[PDB]
Every structure is written in C-alpha cells, then in structure tokens.
JSON list of C-alpha atoms and ligand atoms in Angstrom, two decimals:
[
{"chain": "C", "resi": 1, "resn": "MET", "atom": "CA", "xyz": [-38.90, 75.38, -67.89]},
{"chain": "C", "resi": 2, "resn": "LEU", "atom": "CA", "xyz": [-42.66, 74.59, -68.15]},
{"chain": "C", "resi": 3, "resn": "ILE", "atom": "CA", "xyz": [-45.14, 77.21, -66.83]},
{"chain": "C", "resi": 4, "resn": "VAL", "atom": "CA", "xyz": [-46.41, 76.47, -63.27]},
{"chain": "C", "resi": 5, "resn": "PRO", "atom": "CA", "xyz": [-49.14, 75.80, -62.38]},
{"chain": "C", "resi": 6, "resn": "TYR", "atom": "CA", "xyz": [-49.01, 73.08, -65.10]},
{"chain": "C", "resi": 7, "resn": "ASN", "atom": "CA", "xyz": [-51.80, 70.75, -66.17]},
{"chain": "C", "resi": 8, "resn": "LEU", "atom": "CA", "xyz": [-50.78, 67.33, -67.49]},
{"chain": "C", "resi": 9, "resn": "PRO", "atom": "CA", "xyz": [-53.80, 65.61, -69.17]},
{"chain": "C", "resi": 10, "resn": "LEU", "atom": "CA", "xyz": [-54.00, 61.86, -68.36]},
{"chain": "C", "resi": 11, "resn": "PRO", "atom": "CA", "xyz": [-55.95, 60.51, -71.36]},
{"chain": "C", "resi": 12, "resn": "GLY", "atom": "CA", "xyz": [-58.57, 57.97, -70.25]},
{"chain": "C", "resi": 13, "resn": "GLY", "atom": "CA", "xyz": [-57.51, 58.49, -66.62]},
{"chain": "C", "resi": 14, "resn": "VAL", "atom": "CA", "xyz": [-55.07, 56.39, -64.67]},
{"chain": "C", "resi": 15, "resn": "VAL", "atom": "CA", "xyz": [-54.75, 52.63, -64.52]},
{"chain": "C", "resi": 16, "resn": "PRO", "atom": "CA", "xyz": [-52.41, 50.27, -62.70]},
{"chain": "C", "resi": 17, "resn": "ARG", "atom": "CA", "xyz": [-48.94, 50.09, -64.31]},
{"chain": "C", "resi": 18, "resn": "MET", "atom": "CA", "xyz": [-49.05, 53.78, -65.31]},
{"chain": "C", "resi": 19, "resn": "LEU", "atom": "CA", "xyz": [-45.91, 55.65, -64.10]},
{"chain": "C", "resi": 20, "resn": "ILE", "atom": "CA", "xyz": [-45.93, 59.46, -63.86]},
{"chain": "C", "resi": 21, "resn": "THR", "atom": "CA", "xyz": [-42.51, 61.16, -63.70]},
{"chain": "C", "resi": 22, "resn": "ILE", "atom": "CA", "xyz": [-42.02, 64.80, -62.62]},
{"chain": "C", "resi": 23, "resn": "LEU", "atom": "CA", "xyz": [-38.55, 66.42, -62.91]},
{"chain": "C", "resi": 24, "resn": "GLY", "atom": "CA", "xyz": [-37.94, 69.86, -61.37]},
{"chain": "C", "resi": 25, "resn": "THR", "atom": "CA", "xyz": [-35.82, 71.97, -59.08]},
{"chain": "C", "resi": 26, "resn": "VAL", "atom": "CA", "xyz": [-37.10, 73.47, -55.82]},
{"chain": "C", "resi": 27, "resn": "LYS", "atom": "CA", "xyz": [-36.92, 77.30, -55.76]},
{"chain": "C", "resi": 28, "resn": "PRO", "atom": "CA", "xyz": [-34.88, 79.06, -53.09]},
{"chain": "C", "resi": 29, "resn": "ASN", "atom": "CA", "xyz": [-36.74, 79.58, -49.78]},
{"chain": "C", "resi": 30, "resn": "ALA", "atom": "CA", "xyz": [-39.56, 77.29, -50.93]},
{"chain": "C", "resi": 31, "resn": "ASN", "atom": "CA", "xyz": [-42.82, 77.14, -48.98]},
{"chain": "C", "resi": 32, "resn": "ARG", "atom": "CA", "xyz": [-44.90, 74.44, -50.75]},
{"chain": "C", "resi": 33, "resn": "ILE", "atom": "CA", "xyz": [-45.23, 72.01, -53.64]},
{"chain": "C", "resi": 34, "resn": "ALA", "atom": "CA", "xyz": [-48.47, 70.28, -54.73]},
{"chain": "C", "resi": 35, "resn": "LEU", "atom": "CA", "xyz": [-49.42, 67.44, -57.04]},
{"chain": "C", "resi": 36, "resn": "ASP", "atom": "CA", "xyz": [-53.19, 67.23, -57.55]},
{"chain": "C", "resi": 37, "resn": "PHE", "atom": "CA", "xyz": [-54.58, 64.18, -59.40]},
{"chain": "C", "resi": 38, "resn": "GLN", "atom": "CA", "xyz": [-58.06, 65.44, -60.32]},
{"chain": "C", "resi": 39, "resn": "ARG", "atom": "CA", "xyz": [-61.39, 63.81, -61.13]},
{"chain": "C", "resi": 40, "resn": "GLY", "atom": "CA", "xyz": [-63.16, 66.91, -62.49]},
{"chain": "C", "resi": 41, "resn": "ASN", "atom": "CA", "xyz": [-63.37, 69.29, -59.48]},
{"chain": "C", "resi": 42, "resn": "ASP", "atom": "CA", "xyz": [-62.49, 66.45, -57.05]},
{"chain": "C", "resi": 43, "resn": "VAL", "atom": "CA", "xyz": [-58.89, 65.77, -56.00]},
{"chain": "C", "resi": 44, "resn": "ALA", "atom": "CA", "xyz": [-58.33, 62.01, -55.90]},
{"chain": "C", "resi": 45, "resn": "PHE", "atom": "CA", "xyz": [-54.77, 62.40, -54.55]},
{"chain": "C", "resi": 46, "resn": "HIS", "atom": "CA", "xyz": [-53.21, 65.61, -53.19]},
{"chain": "C", "resi": 47, "resn": "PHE", "atom": "CA", "xyz": [-49.45, 65.24, -52.48]},
{"chain": "C", "resi": 48, "resn": "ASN", "atom": "CA", "xyz": [-48.33, 68.40, -50.63]},
{"chain": "C", "resi": 49, "resn": "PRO", "atom": "CA", "xyz": [-44.79, 68.98, -49.32]},
{"chain": "C", "resi": 50, "resn": "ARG", "atom": "CA", "xyz": [-44.93, 71.83, -46.74]},
{"chain": "C", "resi": 51, "resn": "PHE", "atom": "CA", "xyz": [-41.49, 73.36, -46.00]},
{"chain": "C", "resi": 52, "resn": "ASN", "atom": "CA", "xyz": [-42.72, 75.21, -42.85]},
{"chain": "C", "resi": 53, "resn": "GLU", "atom": "CA", "xyz": [-45.66, 73.94, -40.77]},
{"chain": "C", "resi": 54, "resn": "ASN", "atom": "CA", "xyz": [-44.86, 75.24, -37.26]},
{"chain": "C", "resi": 55, "resn": "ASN", "atom": "CA", "xyz": [-41.10, 75.06, -38.24]},
{"chain": "C", "resi": 56, "resn": "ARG", "atom": "CA", "xyz": [-41.36, 71.38, -39.35]},
{"chain": "C", "resi": 57, "resn": "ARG", "atom": "CA", "xyz": [-41.18, 69.96, -42.90]},
{"chain": "C", "resi": 58, "resn": "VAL", "atom": "CA", "xyz": [-44.02, 67.55, -43.64]},
{"chain": "C", "resi": 59, "resn": "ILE", "atom": "CA", "xyz": [-45.72, 66.00, -46.65]},
{"chain": "C", "resi": 60, "resn": "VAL", "atom": "CA", "xyz": [-49.53, 66.06, -46.37]},
{"chain": "C", "resi": 61, "resn": "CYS", "atom": "CA", "xyz": [-51.66, 63.72, -48.55]},
{"chain": "C", "resi": 62, "resn": "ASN", "atom": "CA", "xyz": [-55.45, 63.96, -48.83]},
{"chain": "C", "resi": 63, "resn": "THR", "atom": "CA", "xyz": [-58.55, 63.72, -51.08]},
{"chain": "C", "resi": 64, "resn": "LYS", "atom": "CA", "xyz": [-61.06, 66.53, -51.86]},
{"chain": "C", "resi": 65, "resn": "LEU", "atom": "CA", "xyz": [-64.69, 65.43, -52.57]},
{"chain": "C", "resi": 66, "resn": "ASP", "atom": "CA", "xyz": [-67.43, 68.02, -53.33]},
{"chain": "C", "resi": 67, "resn": "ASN", "atom": "CA", "xyz": [-64.99, 70.80, -52.13]},
{"chain": "C", "resi": 68, "resn": "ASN", "atom": "CA", "xyz": [-64.40, 69.03, -48.73]},
{"chain": "C", "resi": 69, "resn": "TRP", "atom": "CA", "xyz": [-60.94, 67.84, -47.69]},
{"chain": "C", "resi": 70, "resn": "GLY", "atom": "CA", "xyz": [-60.88, 64.46, -45.94]},
{"chain": "C", "resi": 71, "resn": "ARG", "atom": "CA", "xyz": [-58.60, 62.88, -43.33]},
{"chain": "C", "resi": 72, "resn": "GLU", "atom": "CA", "xyz": [-54.95, 63.86, -43.89]},
{"chain": "C", "resi": 73, "resn": "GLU", "atom": "CA", "xyz": [-52.22, 61.21, -44.15]},
{"chain": "C", "resi": 74, "resn": "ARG", "atom": "CA", "xyz": [-48.80, 62.51, -42.93]},
{"chain": "C", "resi": 75, "resn": "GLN", "atom": "CA", "xyz": [-45.22, 61.51, -43.72]},
{"chain": "C", "resi": 76, "resn": "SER", "atom": "CA", "xyz": [-42.26, 62.94, -41.75]},
{"chain": "C", "resi": 77, "resn": "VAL", "atom": "CA", "xyz": [-39.64, 61.68, -44.31]},
{"chain": "C", "resi": 78, "resn": "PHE", "atom": "CA", "xyz": [-39.02, 64.85, -46.39]},
{"chain": "C", "resi": 79, "resn": "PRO", "atom": "CA", "xyz": [-36.62, 64.30, -49.31]},
{"chain": "C", "resi": 80, "resn": "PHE", "atom": "CA", "xyz": [-36.95, 67.80, -50.89]},
{"chain": "C", "resi": 81, "resn": "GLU", "atom": "CA", "xyz": [-34.48, 70.68, -50.33]},
{"chain": "C", "resi": 82, "resn": "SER", "atom": "CA", "xyz": [-34.72, 74.32, -51.40]},
{"chain": "C", "resi": 83, "resn": "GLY", "atom": "CA", "xyz": [-32.53, 74.91, -54.47]},
{"chain": "C", "resi": 84, "resn": "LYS", "atom": "CA", "xyz": [-32.07, 71.22, -55.41]},
{"chain": "C", "resi": 85, "resn": "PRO", "atom": "CA", "xyz": [-33.21, 69.06, -58.38]},
{"chain": "C", "resi": 86, "resn": "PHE", "atom": "CA", "xyz": [-35.67, 66.24, -57.67]},
{"chain": "C", "resi": 87, "resn": "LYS", "atom": "CA", "xyz": [-37.45, 63.38, -59.43]},
{"chain": "C", "resi": 88, "resn": "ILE", "atom": "CA", "xyz": [-40.95, 62.31, -58.28]},
{"chain": "C", "resi": 89, "resn": "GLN", "atom": "CA", "xyz": [-42.24, 58.97, -59.62]},
{"chain": "C", "resi": 90, "resn": "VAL", "atom": "CA", "xyz": [-45.90, 58.13, -58.99]},
{"chain": "C", "resi": 91, "resn": "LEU", "atom": "CA", "xyz": [-46.71, 54.52, -59.89]},
{"chain": "C", "resi": 92, "resn": "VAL", "atom": "CA", "xyz": [-50.40, 53.57, -59.97]},
{"chain": "C", "resi": 93, "resn": "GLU", "atom": "CA", "xyz": [-50.80, 50.17, -58.32]},
{"chain": "C", "resi": 94, "resn": "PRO", "atom": "CA", "xyz": [-54.12, 48.31, -57.95]},
{"chain": "C", "resi": 95, "resn": "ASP", "atom": "CA", "xyz": [-54.84, 49.49, -54.34]},
{"chain": "C", "resi": 96, "resn": "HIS", "atom": "CA", "xyz": [-52.65, 52.66, -54.03]},
{"chain": "C", "resi": 97, "resn": "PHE", "atom": "CA", "xyz": [-50.51, 55.31, -55.56]},
{"chain": "C", "resi": 98, "resn": "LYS", "atom": "CA", "xyz": [-46.84, 54.46, -54.81]},
{"chain": "C", "resi": 99, "resn": "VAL", "atom": "CA", "xyz": [-44.50, 57.47, -54.62]},
{"chain": "C", "resi": 100, "resn": "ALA", "atom": "CA", "xyz": [-40.68, 57.43, -54.92]},
{"chain": "C", "resi": 101, "resn": "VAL", "atom": "CA", "xyz": [-38.50, 60.58, -54.74]},
{"chain": "C", "resi": 102, "resn": "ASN", "atom": "CA", "xyz": [-34.92, 60.53, -56.10]},
{"chain": "C", "resi": 103, "resn": "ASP", "atom": "CA", "xyz": [-35.24, 56.69, -56.62]},
{"chain": "C", "resi": 104, "resn": "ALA", "atom": "CA", "xyz": [-36.14, 56.05, -52.92]},
{"chain": "C", "resi": 105, "resn": "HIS", "atom": "CA", "xyz": [-39.59, 54.79, -51.92]},
{"chain": "C", "resi": 106, "resn": "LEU", "atom": "CA", "xyz": [-41.37, 57.51, -49.94]},
{"chain": "C", "resi": 107, "resn": "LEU", "atom": "CA", "xyz": [-45.06, 56.62, -49.32]},
{"chain": "C", "resi": 108, "resn": "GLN", "atom": "CA", "xyz": [-48.19, 54.93, -50.64]},
{"chain": "C", "resi": 109, "resn": "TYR", "atom": "CA", "xyz": [-51.74, 56.37, -50.66]},
{"chain": "C", "resi": 110, "resn": "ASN", "atom": "CA", "xyz": [-54.75, 53.99, -50.73]},
{"chain": "C", "resi": 111, "resn": "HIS", "atom": "CA", "xyz": [-57.29, 54.73, -53.46]},
{"chain": "C", "resi": 112, "resn": "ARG", "atom": "CA", "xyz": [-60.26, 56.65, -51.99]},
{"chain": "C", "resi": 113, "resn": "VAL", "atom": "CA", "xyz": [-61.58, 57.66, -55.45]},
{"chain": "C", "resi": 114, "resn": "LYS", "atom": "CA", "xyz": [-62.37, 54.27, -57.09]},
{"chain": "C", "resi": 115, "resn": "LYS", "atom": "CA", "xyz": [-63.11, 55.45, -60.68]},
{"chain": "C", "resi": 116, "resn": "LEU", "atom": "CA", "xyz": [-59.43, 55.52, -61.71]},
{"chain": "C", "resi": 117, "resn": "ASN", "atom": "CA", "xyz": [-60.22, 56.03, -65.42]},
{"chain": "C", "resi": 118, "resn": "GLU", "atom": "CA", "xyz": [-61.97, 59.33, -64.49]},
{"chain": "C", "resi": 119, "resn": "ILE", "atom": "CA", "xyz": [-58.79, 60.81, -62.82]},
{"chain": "C", "resi": 120, "resn": "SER", "atom": "CA", "xyz": [-57.99, 62.60, -66.10]},
{"chain": "C", "resi": 121, "resn": "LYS", "atom": "CA", "xyz": [-55.66, 65.47, -65.14]},
{"chain": "C", "resi": 122, "resn": "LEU", "atom": "CA", "xyz": [-52.60, 66.11, -62.94]},
{"chain": "C", "resi": 123, "resn": "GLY", "atom": "CA", "xyz": [-52.05, 69.66, -61.67]},
{"chain": "C", "resi": 124, "resn": "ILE", "atom": "CA", "xyz": [-48.44, 70.51, -60.69]},
{"chain": "C", "resi": 125, "resn": "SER", "atom": "CA", "xyz": [-48.06, 73.70, -58.60]},
{"chain": "C", "resi": 126, "resn": "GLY", "atom": "CA", "xyz": [-45.90, 75.46, -56.02]},
{"chain": "C", "resi": 127, "resn": "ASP", "atom": "CA", "xyz": [-42.36, 76.64, -55.53]},
{"chain": "C", "resi": 128, "resn": "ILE", "atom": "CA", "xyz": [-40.55, 74.71, -58.27]},
{"chain": "C", "resi": 129, "resn": "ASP", "atom": "CA", "xyz": [-38.93, 75.20, -61.63]},
{"chain": "C", "resi": 130, "resn": "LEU", "atom": "CA", "xyz": [-40.64, 72.41, -63.58]},
{"chain": "C", "resi": 131, "resn": "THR", "atom": "CA", "xyz": [-38.37, 70.66, -66.10]},
{"chain": "C", "resi": 132, "resn": "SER", "atom": "CA", "xyz": [-40.70, 67.93, -67.40]},
{"chain": "C", "resi": 133, "resn": "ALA", "atom": "CA", "xyz": [-43.85, 65.92, -66.59]},
{"chain": "C", "resi": 134, "resn": "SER", "atom": "CA", "xyz": [-44.71, 62.71, -68.45]},
{"chain": "C", "resi": 135, "resn": "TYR", "atom": "CA", "xyz": [-46.15, 59.22, -68.17]},
{"chain": "C", "resi": 136, "resn": "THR", "atom": "CA", "xyz": [-45.37, 55.72, -69.45]},
{"chain": "C", "resi": 137, "resn": "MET", "atom": "CA", "xyz": [-46.98, 52.27, -69.13]},
{"chain": "C", "resi": 138, "resn": "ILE", "atom": "CA", "xyz": [-44.56, 49.76, -67.45]},
{"chain": "K", "resi": 1, "resn": "59O", "atom": "C1", "xyz": [-56.03, 72.53, -43.92]},
{"chain": "K", "resi": 1, "resn": "59O", "atom": "O1", "xyz": [-55.37, 73.16, -44.98]},
{"chain": "K", "resi": 1, "resn": "59O", "atom": "C2", "xyz": [-55.65, 72.55, -46.22]},
{"chain": "K", "resi": 1, "resn": "59O", "atom": "O2", "xyz": [-55.16, 71.20, -46.24]},
{"chain": "K", "resi": 1, "resn": "59O", "atom": "C3", "xyz": [-55.40, 70.52, -47.49]},
{"chain": "K", "resi": 1, "resn": "59O", "atom": "C4", "xyz": [-54.94, 69.09, -47.28]},
{"chain": "K", "resi": 1, "resn": "59O", "atom": "O3", "xyz": [-55.63, 68.48, -46.17]},
{"chain": "K", "resi": 1, "resn": "59O", "atom": "C5", "xyz": [-54.67, 71.28, -48.61]},
{"chain": "K", "resi": 1, "resn": "59O", "atom": "O4", "xyz": [-53.25, 71.11, -48.50]},
{"chain": "K", "resi": 1, "resn": "59O", "atom": "C6", "xyz": [-55.12, 72.75, -48.59]},
{"chain": "K", "resi": 1, "resn": "59O", "atom": "O5", "xyz": [-54.42, 73.62, -49.48]},
{"chain": "K", "resi": 1, "resn": "59O", "atom": "C7", "xyz": [-54.93, 73.79, -50.69]},
{"chain": "K", "resi": 1, "resn": "59O", "atom": "O6", "xyz": [-55.87, 73.15, -51.09]},
{"chain": "K", "resi": 1, "resn": "59O", "atom": "C8", "xyz": [-54.24, 74.87, -51.44]},
{"chain": "K", "resi": 1, "resn": "59O", "atom": "C9", "xyz": [-53.26, 75.68, -50.87]},
{"chain": "K", "resi": 1, "resn": "59O", "atom": "C10", "xyz": [-52.65, 76.68, -51.61]},
{"chain": "K", "resi": 1, "resn": "59O", "atom": "C11", "xyz": [-52.99, 76.90, -52.94]},
{"chain": "K", "resi": 1, "resn": "59O", "atom": "C12", "xyz": [-52.25, 77.92, -53.77]},
{"chain": "K", "resi": 1, "resn": "59O", "atom": "C13", "xyz": [-53.98, 76.11, -53.50]},
{"chain": "K", "resi": 1, "resn": "59O", "atom": "C14", "xyz": [-54.61, 75.11, -52.76]},
{"chain": "K", "resi": 1, "resn": "59O", "atom": "C15", "xyz": [-54.98, 73.42, -47.24]},
{"chain": "K", "resi": 1, "resn": "59O", "atom": "O7", "xyz": [-53.59, 73.57, -46.86]},
{"chain": "K", "resi": 1, "resn": "59O", "atom": "C16", "xyz": [-53.11, 74.79, -46.56]},
{"chain": "K", "resi": 1, "resn": "59O", "atom": "O8", "xyz": [-53.71, 75.82, -46.76]},
{"chain": "K", "resi": 1, "resn": "59O", "atom": "C17", "xyz": [-51.80, 74.73, -45.84]},
{"chain": "K", "resi": 1, "resn": "59O", "atom": "C18", "xyz": [-51.88, 74.82, -44.44]},
{"chain": "K", "resi": 1, "resn": "59O", "atom": "C19", "xyz": [-50.73, 74.93, -43.66]},
{"chain": "K", "resi": 1, "resn": "59O", "atom": "C20", "xyz": [-49.51, 74.90, -44.29]},
{"chain": "K", "resi": 1, "resn": "59O", "atom": "CL1", "xyz": [-48.06, 75.17, -43.39]},
{"chain": "K", "resi": 1, "resn": "59O", "atom": "C21", "xyz": [-49.38, 74.75, -45.64]},
{"chain": "K", "resi": 1, "resn": "59O", "atom": "C22", "xyz": [-50.51, 74.71, -46.40]},
{"chain": "K", "resi": 1, "resn": "59O", "atom": "N1", "xyz": [-50.27, 74.80, -47.87]},
{"chain": "K", "resi": 1, "resn": "59O", "atom": "O9", "xyz": [-49.27, 74.20, -48.37]},
{"chain": "K", "resi": 1, "resn": "59O", "atom": "O10", "xyz": [-50.98, 75.58, -48.51]},
{"chain": "K", "resi": 2, "resn": "CL", "atom": "CL1", "xyz": [-45.48, 75.14, -70.41]},
{"chain": "K", "resi": 3, "resn": "CL", "atom": "CL1", "xyz": [-65.15, 57.06, -57.12]}
]
C-alpha cells in the first residue's frame, strides 16, 4: 500500500482528456475520504465522502480560495462501503471534473478555478488503504 496522505504530482497541471484513477480499499469503521486537487495552497476541487454527518453518508464537494471554503455541492448517492475495494475515476472535461466510482457515473463539478494547468498536485487522504494512483491521457 502507498503511504496516506499521498501526493500525486500532476505535471503541467490538468487538461481536458486527462483521466486520474485511484484504487484503494476503505478501512473498517471509516469516517472520511478526501481528494484535493490543489493549485498551490488553493483547492480547486475537494471531493469528500463523509461516512457520518448527523448519521447520514454524504459526499461534499467544494473549492478553497485564499484559505476560504466556498459553497458546498452535495451528492446523496454514496457508493463507498467500509471494508470494500473501490475505483475512483476523475475525468477532466472542458467545463467540469466528471467522477465515476466502480464504473458508475457519480457526479460532475463545474470548474471554479480556471487555470487548469496550475492545478499541479492531487492530495489523497482519509480512511483508506491506497493501492495505486495514476493518470493517463484518453
Ligand atoms: C465545514 O467543514 C469543512 O468543509 C469543507 C468543505 O466545505 C472541508 O470538507 C473541511 O475539511 C477539511 O478541510 C479537512 C478536514 C479534515 C482534515 C484531516 C483535513 C482537512 C471541513 O469539513 C469538516 O471538517 C467536516 C465536517 C463535518 C463532517 Cl461530518 C466531516 C468533515 N470532514 O470530513 O472532515
Ligand atoms: Cl508511498
Ligand atoms: Cl483561476
């Protein structure tokens, strides 16, 4: 397993047609997972499965600019399960990030950070055993 939290450099930032694939297994009794696509200290796209927010499972998505979180976008479809292997695929499209989990479309997140080629790192954190993290151009 890779060491979490894990930084995946994205050389030259992201660009449409770039596919990021994360393979891992959720720990037992998980509380949270996070993917943070970063532009220096800013978070262009925060993808945050929460296993217990007032006894509900929810994925929260947001952007952090100058240390300030913005308006959350929330998804009640929740494909993750404590103890089970998952695949997250993040495809950069021209107007949004498109996210699929276990080969099923989950959500899309409109680009708030516009300088895509400056989103140069992906942080992977939370209650997972991380198997692999990679990218390819499709
Ligand atoms: C309002 O709360 C914030 O919302 C943001 C999204 O809008 C982030 O998700 C923040 O989290 C972190 O930036 C962050 C959190 C932990 C670390 C180890 C590093 C960074 C934080 O979320 C929680 O604290 C939170 C609030 C309620 C619940 Cl139930 C779960 C979470 N959470 O997953 O941390
Ligand atoms: Cl590692
Ligand atoms: Cl920008």
